[PDB]
Amino acid sequence: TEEQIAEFKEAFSLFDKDGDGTITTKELGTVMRSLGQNPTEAELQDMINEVDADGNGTIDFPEFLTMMARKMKDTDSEEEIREAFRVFDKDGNGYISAAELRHVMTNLGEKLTDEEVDEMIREADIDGDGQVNYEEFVQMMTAK
Amino acid sequence: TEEQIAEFKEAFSLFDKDGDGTITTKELGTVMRSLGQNPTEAELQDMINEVDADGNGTIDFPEFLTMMARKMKDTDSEEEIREAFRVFDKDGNGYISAAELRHVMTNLGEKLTDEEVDEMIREADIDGDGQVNYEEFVQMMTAK
Amino acid sequence: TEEQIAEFKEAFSLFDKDGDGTITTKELGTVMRSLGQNPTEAELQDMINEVDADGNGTIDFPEFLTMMARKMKDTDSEEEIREAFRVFDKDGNGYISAAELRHVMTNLGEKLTDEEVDEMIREADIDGDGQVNYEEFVQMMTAK
Amino acid sequence: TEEQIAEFKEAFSLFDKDGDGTITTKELGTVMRSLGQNPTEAELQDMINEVDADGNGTIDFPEFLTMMARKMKDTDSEEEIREAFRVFDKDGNGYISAAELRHVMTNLGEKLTDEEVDEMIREADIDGDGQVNYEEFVQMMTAK
Amino acid sequence: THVQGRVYNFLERPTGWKCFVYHFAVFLIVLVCLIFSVLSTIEQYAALATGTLFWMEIVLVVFFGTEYVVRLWSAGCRSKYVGLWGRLRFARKPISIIDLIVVVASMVVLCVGSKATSAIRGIRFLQILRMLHVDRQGGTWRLLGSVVFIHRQELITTLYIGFLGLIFSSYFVYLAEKDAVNESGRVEFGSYADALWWGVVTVTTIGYGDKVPQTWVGKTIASCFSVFAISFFALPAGILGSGFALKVQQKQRQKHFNRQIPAAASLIQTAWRCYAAENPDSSTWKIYILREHHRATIKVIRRMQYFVAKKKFQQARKPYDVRDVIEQYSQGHLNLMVRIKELQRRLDQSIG
Amino acid sequence: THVQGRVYNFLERPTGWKCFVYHFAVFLIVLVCLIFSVLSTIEQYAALATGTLFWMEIVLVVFFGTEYVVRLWSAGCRSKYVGLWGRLRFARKPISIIDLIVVVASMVVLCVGSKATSAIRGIRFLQILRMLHVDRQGGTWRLLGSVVFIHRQELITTLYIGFLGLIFSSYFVYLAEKDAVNESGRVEFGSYADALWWGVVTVTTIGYGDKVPQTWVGKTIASCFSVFAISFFALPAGILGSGFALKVQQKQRQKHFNRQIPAAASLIQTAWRCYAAENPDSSTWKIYILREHHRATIKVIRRMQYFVAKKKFQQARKPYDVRDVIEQYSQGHLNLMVRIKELQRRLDQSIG
Amino acid sequence: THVQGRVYNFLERPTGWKCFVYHFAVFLIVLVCLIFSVLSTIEQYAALATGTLFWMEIVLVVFFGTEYVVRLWSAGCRSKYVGLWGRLRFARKPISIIDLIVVVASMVVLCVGSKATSAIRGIRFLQILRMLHVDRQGGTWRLLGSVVFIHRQELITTLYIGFLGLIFSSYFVYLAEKDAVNESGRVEFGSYADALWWGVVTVTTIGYGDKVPQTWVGKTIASCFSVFAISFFALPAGILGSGFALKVQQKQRQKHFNRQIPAAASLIQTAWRCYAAENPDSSTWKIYILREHHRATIKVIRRMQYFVAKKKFQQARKPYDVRDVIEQYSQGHLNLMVRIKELQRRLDQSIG
Amino acid sequence: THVQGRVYNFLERPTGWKCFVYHFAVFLIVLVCLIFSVLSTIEQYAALATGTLFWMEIVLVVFFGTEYVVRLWSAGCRSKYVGLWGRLRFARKPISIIDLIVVVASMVVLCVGSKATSAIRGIRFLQILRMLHVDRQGGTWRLLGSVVFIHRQELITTLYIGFLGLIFSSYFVYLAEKDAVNESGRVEFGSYADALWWGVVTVTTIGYGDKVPQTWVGKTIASCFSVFAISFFALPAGILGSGFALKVQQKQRQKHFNRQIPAAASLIQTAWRCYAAENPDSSTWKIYILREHHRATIKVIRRMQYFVAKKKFQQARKPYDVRDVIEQYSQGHLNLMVRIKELQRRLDQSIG
Ligand SMILES: [Ca+2]
Ligand SMILES: [Ca+2]
Ligand SMILES: [Ca+2]
Ligand SMILES: [Ca+2]
Ligand SMILES: [Ca+2]
Ligand SMILES: [Ca+2]
Ligand SMILES: [Ca+2]
Ligand SMILES: [Ca+2]
């Protein structure tokens, strides 16, 4: 929609903060370290290699529109998220325990804070039975 | 022709400027930086790997004659140039717009000056319709 | 067994000596250099890549239990040890000499001391005939 | 022969000059630089990777005997030397000119001195016709 | 506590040796019953087998009915098959529909018979159709479907060439042998229908010989057709054999299951964070640490983290190739360039 | 504005589901008409189909004529097919020539018939020939031609071996069975023509049996021939199946379409600069900045830039391999050698 | 000193040219005797061959008995075949059991005959069974078993599809041709037994023609069956040919035999050290140098060294791949990071 | 000056378009003469072709005689074929021997005939034998020999399995059908000779049907034999097709011809230096610069240089693989370790 295009326009302008019309890894790292995100060249290349579809190594306005034309509710999206829940399902019988989920969240990734760990155990719980109904969890991830 | 051989002879002598009979990446970089072409070892290896057909890593007189025995009007040449115009033809319907050509020229390559951008839009234009007749453009590239 | 689990528990605690619950290459190198084992990052990565089954790069208690659940008397174990004795059997006729074994032990590996070389030539010897009965040697490696 | 074994023995002793019984890249480089051969680690690894058949990275006496058990008059040897003369035979008609041989010898390899270039043009010449009889040249390489 | 999972493993997915041998015994006894029913029509076992058909039929239908009932009851272990809706989803599967159709047809025919040849043949059909139930991982049908899906354009092209070649060859055969009469006076090629039948026989190399050209030109064109189009007839066997061989070759280059665990966890975390970006009153915003217009920036950061996690997930599912080496070398070279530049700047500052 | 492009996409290159199903329906109705015409000669549909042949014939010829006309009119979208010369170039294509020949033959036969068996057979021939029009990307003919071109020497060698083997085997069969008489007195091998026919039948495994050797030596030599030469007969199927399998395997290692965009742009720029090197009065010479004899040097620089761009283009079209890793490692090692040498020189200067 | 090894090499594992030609001569004379016995029943050699059967039989049985005796005596060279128990282990091998059974059956039949057709046929059976003794490295049976073991699920799937397809096709053929009567009044398809026989003939492309459908629908369904299921019939040849081709392709990427010697020696040393960890009174504990509770730590160190040696052994047996390059690059990058960090720390300390 | 080379290129190794079309015309006219001679025996061309056989025979023998003479004369261009000994070496080649035998047989038969069927057949044999002369690069015979040599053990194993399987299957067929009588009273399986013939027909899928089992057990064992052993019959086609496919796949990874020039030159120089090490009075010893016992050291240095050059030559002939990357990374890492160690030592000296 036109309003969505305008929103992407001011988002691009704010993320640029330079007026050149192209946004670089230097500027992205600068804004993250202003926020305090201690960036890395690994993050910079993980950004360049996929979003920058033109291939010039920068972030142009038409490029940004192309990557904002994405959609997270794709059939491929819920299929891959379901397979991801199947990745750590060691038993393979459709039974998933909350203890292993808590351990993985705490010891891997961003090292989830106890607040968001409690958020995990409260949102994904059928009356706190320990066996989360991950299909409806996938549905309400996709529903957003 | 004999005159062509002589022309290649003085071209080799001028590009050498040393009298050793062999021309190296050091001398090529020196002459480019005298012209002001801020060379790079990447350019030096991109030169060595293809022209230096003998494989000794230098530029000898018989080598230079072998690489000047080239011809840019080869059937393979216009075939590959036509495929190259097909590379960025996103639509694939034979329609090419001048706006994308201008954007690519300005934002990629040598960062074409506005003068040569105007040269592009004036030479490749059927009365300025925006749909260049790229087949005749290929023909008059090959015709030189 | 429960006693075996307890033994693994105090072994993990002693090898940690930090109380964090996870043991790192830094601590392992520190304890080895306290023993005097002049460690190397090659040894550290050769440790991480195989024992650390979780993949977090450390030594956790459940991980340590998983790697202590091993067994050295496996059919694959004696098969691979028999193939290993077949590796340096140059003749391939089932005849193995003690001289080559002594030379290999002295000039390769940990550079076996004369004491353990004598241990080799006395344990693996059918009345000192020079032709060791390597099948029973494999059996009493596996029997432990 | 026993005399050949003894010759290899004193050759090994002279090339060692240390008495350890094993000869290393350090000692080989030292003796070459005493001769004045300005060695390189590339030469050292090109030596280790092929002669050192045991794989310990040094030059032991049994190893040296194994590599001196070679023979340069092997059928594979003259076959590969004939193919090597076929490698630079650009025409492929069995005709080889002495001018290209002289140019290759002078501009590649050890940069053959004019003395050995004259040796080339005098030994390999059927009355100085310029078309060397390379089959008999191969035969008298193999005959030694 | 785990009785439902245990019975589900015992029934749906046998493994090890106990359940594997049990399922093998069931399969072999089913095949023995099928072959005995095949031999029943022959006069050797015309009477005894037919008399014993009803007993084995009722025993088998009872066994498969109980098996279907217990499998449906144990289907509740799967999260997607929990409740009445989940049981319906399990039943709506093609295999479950096949099983219920087979058992209902069996009970219908048995109750009608209790109080002919077509009924018995339908019994064999439902037995061999239920025999397909042993396929549990889809290793036959799903595998062949995937193989076809990979090579759709190739099979389309090959079939197109084969049909066109056989059609032209049959037309040439007919025009050469319009008046084809074999020995002792029979018109073998009565029409191009006969020509097409001879062509398909030749391409399948049956060689029945009921329609064989009797002219030299016909023999030559038949030889040319055999040279050209029989290769099309032999294609798919070699094609899918090579496909299986290359799949097995690539089966040796998969990363260990623990390598994709960090990528899966990271993508789950990023997906949850993107979903929770719609919750303004969350308390996780200050963990990164006043904040009024930075919510959009945080949403963009979470979105790009989710995209990076998606890239990591696609990288995890694919085997090793040159791209991993290229990117590893690129990141190492960039790191060492950066470190050398920092050292150069610091040394230039220090020297003065 | 885009109506010509839209109709060109609808007709020439169907995609998605609407046009794809439309073209599938057209193809299936064409095949149904073809099979009904095939069944027409049989007495089941001798009268009704023949009576209805003219109606379907005129309807189809009108449909294909309109389709050809609209496709030719829409061909003007392509730049190479603009104007009368472009329309002629479109018509000079083999597919366009085939279509126009088919439609003109159809209208000729229909107008002659309006005011026999051969005419109807030619109608079927033109229908199946126009049926080849569905090939639009050349995925059948161009693909098979490319596959043959890749393996020309291999097919030449294999065919050479096969023909020589079958020729010697047939000669041995004839010399063994010059007086071959089967049961009840027929000379099956009347000549080496019969021997050659038996040999081709054996290598194609038809097994008609009209000429079968009756001697033990003949049986042994026939067995040897079957062992040796039938493999030649079975070659091409497996050969091109393996070729397709390896092509599909290599289909996973192509760079993204945006990676070759910089190379294409650079080569276009270098080509234009080389062409414009012939224009002395250009104003782009001073952009690099007095200049009298440096025009030749600038021409050489542009030529070497064009050669480098050509190398980049050839690199873009080929998939990943060891060469890319080798050159990347070489450039990185050279860069770090250069940087370390610069650091060493600067430090030696600084220490004094 | 080495006479037992020499005779073992001469008998069990011929190599070079002398023993190789000797074994080839033995094999060819055995085959000549077999083919002469095959020709014996024919009247050309009915009398002379039968009269000479006993002489060659006794000579051969004596030769193979002496060969078996000398091979069993020379089996003592192998360490696992030392002593009476080792001789029994050698005899318990399937090949040794086959040889002893063959020789005992031969001597039994010869002594019974000395003082009919079935006996002679059993003689041929034991001769061709002993003929299998030439397989010494298992290159036939062990290789085929390994190839099957690698592709067990693939052959299971392919066979499953093939049998199901042929079963349904045969049922369709029977239902189409229940009343199948060919020319001059014979019921070719008397039952679905005949239908199954015709189906297996078609899938094997024998084309005997004793049961050929006479209806158009039968011909169409037979053509569909030939298109679908004959590929299954042709699968295994191409499958294992591709397997052999890929094995030979991978045969070029093995490390030299001296490369695994250090890994083997290290794993032997670690295994011995782990075994000796149970010996508290050993004198090797102080070599690493007071020690009371460190025995468990030393045991853990030896265990992890043994695990690392096992990893090295598994790496040695596998050919080169991307993993080796990845780990080499990782270790080099880690080393140079560590060295650069040390240099940075030392320079920061020095500058002050 | 180059007339001998030009005629050698024109005759032995045609290339381009002129000589290529000339040789193609010669080959096609030879094939036309062969097929006309094949058709000569048939009564259509019984008289005219036979009357014209002598004219074409003498013309062709004169043409091939002149061609052989000029080729032998032009063979002197090759260095190994210089002089009478070189001409004999050229003549001793199998192709030259074949050509001279063919021409001498042709002139003998023509002079005898001038002043029967077997002679004409021998004429065809020598024509098709001389037809093999078009093979000049050995692309058929040498290629097949190399392919066999690569897979000797694989073909040995496969053939062994195939013959054993067919032998046991034929024995089972005979024991099942000892009294095999087909319809209307003929003993189809009169013996295991008939059983072997039926087995080879089945494995080759000829399906003549002269010996078809009439029992159910015979049909089952024949089906098992067809399932097992026909794959062996189909092996070699797929095996060598996969071999050709992998060879073509590896044809894309060869280094340019100029890359092996330095290795060849270095190995030639080292070989000459090793040969000249036997010449004490040479003047090249002082180029490296008093020298009494260093001659042995110089010989060892030259020998190790020759070995290194041999390693470079073996590396040049093999395509790219992981070993090149491994050694390049190893040398780069060693260089940068050495440089960093030198820098560390110099900095430690400087800081004091
Ligand atoms: Ca903007
Ligand atoms: Ca910045
Ligand atoms: Ca010059
Ligand atoms: Ca310079
Ligand atoms: Ca603890
Ligand atoms: Ca520490
Ligand atoms: Ca010594
Ligand atoms: Ca030194």
Author numbering:
A (entry chain F), B (entry chain D), C (entry chain H), D (entry chain B): 6 to 149
E (entry chain E), F (entry chain C), G (entry chain G), H (entry chain A): 104 to 218, 223 to 396, 506 to 568
Q: What did the study's authors say about this model?
A:
The KCNQ1 Kv channel, also known as Kv7.1, is the pore-forming subunit of the slow delayed rectifier potassium channel (IKS) that plays an important role in the repolarization phase of cardiac action potentials. Importantly, KCNQ1 and other Kv7 members are regulated both by membrane voltage and the signaling lipid phosphatidylinositol 4,5-bisphosphate (PIP2). The voltage sensors close the channel at hyperpolarizing membrane voltages, while PIP2 is required for the channel to open. The human KCNQ1 channel was purified as a complex with the structurally obligate subunit calmodulin in the presence of Ca2+ and reconstituted into liposomes composed of 90: 5: 5 1-palmitoyl-2-oleoyl-sn-glycero-3-phosphocholine (POPC) to 1-palmitoyl-2- oleoyl-sn-glycero-3-phosphoglycerol (POPG) to cholesterol [wt: wt: wt] with 300 mM KCl.
